[PDB]
């Protein structure tokens, strides 16, 4: 991986790390629609996104840059607060892990 690549990993493993999980767990692997009774998932989410997917697609050396790594973080919290109410639980997690994702890639190096 390159240098901001190196960067977005070690966000990716402070995201994945037990410091964030009693926040972060909602985003661990993808939304089971049919588990949860979620059946308007996938007709209001047309690409769903989680920490498991971007953690899958960093091992295969798939992102060719920062900004590609960012978009797919950035897409997960956007579905989360497409589909959910405001005042649902999981959007107030939503919230505090992506609060911990912008102050740490803010810190990119150049
Ligand atoms: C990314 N996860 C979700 O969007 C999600 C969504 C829902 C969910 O039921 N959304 C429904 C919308 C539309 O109708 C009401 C709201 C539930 C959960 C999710 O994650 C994990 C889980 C099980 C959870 C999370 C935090 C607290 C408790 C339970």
């Not at 390159?2 to 985003?27: R, V």
């Not at 588990?35 to 798939?62: C, Q």
């Not at 959007?91 to 892990?97: C, D, E, G, S």
């Amino acid at each position: 991986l390159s240098e901001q690549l190196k960067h977005c990993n070690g966000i990716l493993k402070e995201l994945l790390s037990k410091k964030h999980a009693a926040y972060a767990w909602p985003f661990y692997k993808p939304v089971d629609a049919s588990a949860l009774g979620l059946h308007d998932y996938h007709d209001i989410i047309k690409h769903p996104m989680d920490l498991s997917t971007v953690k899958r697609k960093m091992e295969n050396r798939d992102y060719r840059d920062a900004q590609e790594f960012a978009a797919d973080v950035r897409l997960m919290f956007s579905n989360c607060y497409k589909y959910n109410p405001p005042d649902h639980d999981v959007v107030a997690m939503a919230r505090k892990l992506q609060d911990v994702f912008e102050f740490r890639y803010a810190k990119m190096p150049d």
